[PDB]
Design an enzyme around this catalytic site. Structure first.
Site, mmCIF file in Angstrom:
data_model
loop_
_atom_site.group_PDB
_atom_site.id
_atom_site.type_symbol
_atom_site.label_atom_id
_atom_site.label_comp_id
_atom_site.label_asym_id
_atom_site.label_seq_id
_atom_site.Cartn_x
_atom_site.Cartn_y
_atom_site.Cartn_z
ATOM 1 N N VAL A 51 57.331 48.686 60.804
ATOM 2 C CA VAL A 51 57.843 49.454 59.666
ATOM 3 C C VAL A 51 57.884 48.586 58.410
ATOM 4 O O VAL A 51 57.349 48.957 57.360
ATOM 5 C CB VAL A 51 59.225 50.047 59.988
ATOM 6 C CG1 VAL A 51 59.837 50.660 58.735
ATOM 7 C CG2 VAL A 51 59.115 51.121 61.107
ATOM 8 N N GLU A 59 62.682 50.745 56.809
ATOM 9 C CA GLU A 59 62.238 50.595 55.430
ATOM 10 C C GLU A 59 62.952 51.644 54.591
ATOM 11 O O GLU A 59 63.015 52.813 54.988
ATOM 12 C CB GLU A 59 60.712 50.761 55.315
ATOM 13 C CG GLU A 59 60.184 50.790 53.874
ATOM 14 C CD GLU A 59 58.690 51.105 53.822
ATOM 15 O OE1 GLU A 59 58.318 52.272 54.085
ATOM 16 O OE2 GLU A 59 57.892 50.189 53.537
ATOM 17 N N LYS A 141 60.334 63.557 59.101
ATOM 18 C CA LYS A 141 58.901 63.299 59.151
ATOM 19 C C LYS A 141 58.567 62.411 60.343
ATOM 20 O O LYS A 141 59.388 61.608 60.792
ATOM 21 C CB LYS A 141 58.398 62.613 57.864
ATOM 22 N N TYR A 269 49.550 53.786 47.194
ATOM 23 C CA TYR A 269 50.529 52.793 47.638
ATOM 24 C C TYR A 269 49.944 51.406 47.433
ATOM 25 O O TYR A 269 48.908 51.082 48.019
ATOM 26 C CB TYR A 269 50.882 52.967 49.118
ATOM 27 C CG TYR A 269 51.495 54.283 49.491
ATOM 28 C CD1 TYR A 269 52.875 54.413 49.680
ATOM 29 C CD2 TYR A 269 50.695 55.410 49.664
ATOM 30 C CE1 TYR A 269 53.425 55.641 50.051
ATOM 31 C CE2 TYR A 269 51.239 56.633 50.023
ATOM 32 C CZ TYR A 269 52.595 56.745 50.207
ATOM 33 O OH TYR A 269 53.105 57.978 50.566
ATOM 34 N N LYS A 334 57.820 55.437 43.530
ATOM 35 C CA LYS A 334 58.858 55.093 44.493
ATOM 36 C C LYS A 334 58.657 53.650 44.907
ATOM 37 O O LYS A 334 57.524 53.160 44.952
ATOM 38 C CB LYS A 334 58.814 55.957 45.756
ATOM 39 C CG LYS A 334 58.893 57.448 45.516
ATOM 40 C CD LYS A 334 58.932 58.170 46.865
ATOM 41 C CE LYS A 334 58.890 59.677 46.691
ATOM 42 N NZ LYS A 334 58.829 60.371 48.005
ATOM 43 N N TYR A 336 59.470 50.818 48.021
ATOM 44 C CA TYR A 336 59.687 50.744 49.461
ATOM 45 C C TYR A 336 60.159 49.333 49.777
ATOM 46 O O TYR A 336 59.431 48.370 49.513
ATOM 47 C CB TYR A 336 58.393 51.069 50.210
ATOM 48 C CG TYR A 336 57.889 52.476 49.947
ATOM 49 C CD1 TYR A 336 57.965 53.454 50.928
ATOM 50 C CD2 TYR A 336 57.353 52.820 48.717
ATOM 51 C CE1 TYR A 336 57.519 54.744 50.683
ATOM 52 C CE2 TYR A 336 56.905 54.112 48.469
ATOM 53 C CZ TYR A 336 56.993 55.057 49.454
ATOM 54 O OH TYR A 336 56.552 56.340 49.208
#
Ligand SMILES: N[C@@H](Cc1c[nH]c2ccccc12)C(=O)O
Length: 353
Positions: A51, A59, A141, A269, A334, A336
């Protein structure tokens, strides 16, 4: 302190910092329910996770632009003392969510015998996660690994997933996304575990050894991904580098029967732990790319401070990714972030890989 208790505290603090209100409380409860199966595990009691790149099994992701704040986590189902590719934990978490939260298991169930096999070839077989916006219901999800039948099987396994969902007519979307055969490779398949029309099936791709121009060429097919803007963003977040020389760029595309002009069709990303000396440099890059939006930077700074637990200049590994999607008038970004339960400065592809 158990992994679950440590990460639940961080998640609750992050929700409080974001003023999520009662939605945040429910969100922490969902995190606790999903990580109950880690049991009494401290960090060293769990196998290294995919992760976060340092091996941490959680995360955190924070929407930086949203008027109403929006918080997400991803985690890896794991059995303390069992290899991560063992499928028990991943098979158990779907019925847990279906029963406790009414999450939709119908797509998951159509796929699980193929995507969560007994003897997976790769080291990891699932991630699960949840996202909440203030005042709205939590949405769950699942992520499946497209390398579970071997790295050369990723397209065949994906196609077989579309077979099971009745969506092989969407294969052209997958095919068109590949521009450099053998180097643009699908590696995750994600399901929104909801039964409503907003629920998405998404394919994540790695772009190995890609120049920023090649990443922009992939994304320009989707509304709002102007190549000049995509190239400029990648360059800023890479400190001026023009090529994803080790850690691949990542994109994802939603598989849909029609175009969607809300600009939710695709996401970029940019990985952040291999193209900088340390997380202080990464923070400076975020301040550069979000310069025009001080409210976003205040939110980012505040959430980073609640998650980092050492000096930013000690190494990389707190920042995993920043994502980028076009918006009506401004990009949607966003960040992470890792809880860094293990070592600073993870290698490309993460310690588990
Ligand atoms: N850490 C894994 C999986 C993952 C977690 N968060 C992500 C965000 C984007 C893409 C992949 C991921 C990877 O980098 O591949």
């Amino acid at each position: 302190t158990t992994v679950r208790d440590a990460c639940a505290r961080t998640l609750e603090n992050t929700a409080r910092t974001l003023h999520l209100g009662a939605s945040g409380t429910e969100f922490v409860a969902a995190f606790r329910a999903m990580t109950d199966h880690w049991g009494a595990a401290r960090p060293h009691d769990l196998p290294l996770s995919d992760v976060s790149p340092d091996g941490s099994p959680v995360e955190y992701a924070v929407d930086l632009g949203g008027l109403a704040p929006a918080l997400q986590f991803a985690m890896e189902p794991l059995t303390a003392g069992v290899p991560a590719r063992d499928p028990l934990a991943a098979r158990a978490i779907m019925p847990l969510l279906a029963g406790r939260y009414g999450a939709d298991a119908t797509r998951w169930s159509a796929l699980a015998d193929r995507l969560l096999p007994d003897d997976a070839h790769g080291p990891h077989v699932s991630m699960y996660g949840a996202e909440v916006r203030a005042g709205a219901p939590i949405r769950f999800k699942a992520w499946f690994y497209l390398n579970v039948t071997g790295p050369d099987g990723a397209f065949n396994l994906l196609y077989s997933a579309l077979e099971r969902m009745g969506t092989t007519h969407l294969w052209p979307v997958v095919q068109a996304h590949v521009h450099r055969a053998g180097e643009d490779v699908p590696f995750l398949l994600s399901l929104d575990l909801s039964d409503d029309p907003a629920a998405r099936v998404k394919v994540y791709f790695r772009h190995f050894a890609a120049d920023v121009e090649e990443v922009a060429a992939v994304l320009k097919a989707y509304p709002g991904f102007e190549p000049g803007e995509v190239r400029a963003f990648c360059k800023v977040m890479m400190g001026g580098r023009r090529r994803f020389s080790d850690q691949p760029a990542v994109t994802c595309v939603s598989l849909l029967d029609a175009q969607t002009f809300d600009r939710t069709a695709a996401t970029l990303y940019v990985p952040l732990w291999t193209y900088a000396e340390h997380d202080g440099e990464v923070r400076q890059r975020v301040h550069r790319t979000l310069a025009a939006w001080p409210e976003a930077l205040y939110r980012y700074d505040s959430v980073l401070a609640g998650i980092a637990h050492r000096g930013l200049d000690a190494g990389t590994g707190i920042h995993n990714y920043i994502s980028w999607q076009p918006g009506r008038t401004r990009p949607r970004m966003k960040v992470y972030l890792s809880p860094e339960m293990h070592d600073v400065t993870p290698p490309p592809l993460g310690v588990s890989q």
